[PDB]
Design an enzyme around this catalytic site. Structure first.
Site, PDB file in Angstrom:
ATOM      1  N   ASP A 191      21.298  -1.287  -5.825  1.00 44.45           N
ATOM      2  CA  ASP A 191      22.324  -0.210  -5.715  1.00 44.45           C
ATOM      3  C   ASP A 191      23.721  -0.821  -5.589  1.00 44.45           C
ATOM      4  O   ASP A 191      24.592  -0.580  -6.404  1.00 44.45           O
ATOM      5  CB  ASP A 191      21.958   0.558  -4.443  1.00 44.45           C
ATOM      6  CG  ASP A 191      23.118   1.470  -4.043  1.00 44.45           C
ATOM      7  OD1 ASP A 191      24.010   0.995  -3.359  1.00 44.45           O
ATOM      8  OD2 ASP A 191      23.098   2.627  -4.428  1.00 44.45           O
ATOM      9  N   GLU A 192      23.945  -1.612  -4.574  1.00 43.21           N
ATOM     10  CA  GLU A 192      25.285  -2.240  -4.396  1.00 43.21           C
ATOM     11  C   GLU A 192      25.191  -3.399  -3.394  1.00 43.21           C
ATOM     12  O   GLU A 192      25.095  -3.175  -2.205  1.00 43.21           O
ATOM     13  CB  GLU A 192      26.174  -1.126  -3.840  1.00 43.21           C
ATOM     14  CG  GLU A 192      27.629  -1.393  -4.228  1.00 43.21           C
ATOM     15  CD  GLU A 192      27.735  -1.548  -5.746  1.00 43.21           C
ATOM     16  OE1 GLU A 192      27.769  -0.534  -6.425  1.00 43.21           O
ATOM     17  OE2 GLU A 192      27.777  -2.677  -6.206  1.00 43.21           O
TER      18      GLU A 192
END
Ligand SMILES: [Zn+2]
Length: 57
Positions: free
Chosen positions: A37-38
């Site tokens: 995701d990040e």
């Protein structure tokens, strides 16, 4: 769920907004996880109602 360990008076705050109570500031720190995701995200805890979300740096 009986004990806890939250902190607010500490952690340098940053100027941001709160999508919950509309505050204008929040605390901030980094929170890296695995990978999906990040990588390395920063959570911002508003300095009014006590709400926190995530950034992208
Ligand atoms: Zn707030």
């Amino acid at each position: 769920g009986s004990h806890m360990e939250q902190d607010l008076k500490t952690l340098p705050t940053t100027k941001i907004t709160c999508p919950k109570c509309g505050n204008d500031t929040a605390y901030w720190w980094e929170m890296q996880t695995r990978a999906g995701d990040e990588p390395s995200t920063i959570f911002y805890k508003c300095t009014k109602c006590g709400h926190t979300w995530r950034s992208y740096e």
